[PDB]
């Protein structure tokens, strides 16, 4: 017996292992395979059956979902970047600084710099921010997992002209797929908690 | 209009050191958009062939690809310091302990060292589950450089009669039938010129 969960790339460096530990303790024989993919590929994996569950942020008639949690993100820059020497920054300065963007396409309202690089996960983005290649938005969870990031990265104070950066994480599945007892248990467990 | 360079790093190589090549390209081509994506081995190759990527970071390894070897990346079998096994271990116990296997999304016996295993497609996911005491696994030494916290939580396995060598040989791969931009050609010449020694 086995269970494949696809975590969308942008949610990899958030906090999802509690659900795996829950499943392992209740189903100690279960092989649990954790894969990652972009949103669009993860959806197709649910529909063609290669994954039973998906962790997604912001679907059609054929999926169901239950809400999991909010994940906060933080705009950051390297402490040794020239822009980091200032208490405050203007929009004009952000406009002229390279943004490291995590996606894939690109929603223009989450783009604030004229020039930008695209990467598909936050680890790659964090590495390039640490090399002073630009600024970007990283999950707060990464500073829990790696406290030394606080010594290297500083929060950009950018909030007066940017939206609150956050993910609303849902547990998603295909209505017309066959869910094993393990997947069903997890869905019942969460629903039962939410009330 | 607006020059682009897309590099696909295969999943297994995501938590190795590939960032020096990006800084080299950026300092030489300051107006170049450099997109770093990740994919399984099989999909990364198709990205080269259909043009979605100009360059690929692949390991171990078709007559349509050309490549130049970059470096060896060392990997370490590790377990959480609070795992029940860590308070003492034999090879028999490793056989009976769950292995968290990292492999692009099938598994040859050469990648499997325990009777039972879970499969994940990148080392961050594997590391998270090793940290939760869900098993042991093989992680790049690079992860401990990038995250010193991991040394507080994980220990290298020391097991009698268990001495395999884990390593990747990383290659820079491209399609011989695609046309490489100037940035990709610069990197290839830079690497080949270094290997002259």
From TrEMBL, chain B:
Keywords for the protein's UniProt record, in alphabetical order: DNA-binding, Transcription, Transcription regulation
Keyword Transcription annotated: yes
Sample GO molecular function, one term: transcription cis-regulatory region binding
Family: Belongs to the LysR transcriptional regulatory family.
Designated name of the protein: Bacterial regulatory helix-turn-helix protein, lysR family protein
Organism: Acinetobacter baumannii
Stretch of the intact protein here: 91 to 294 of 297
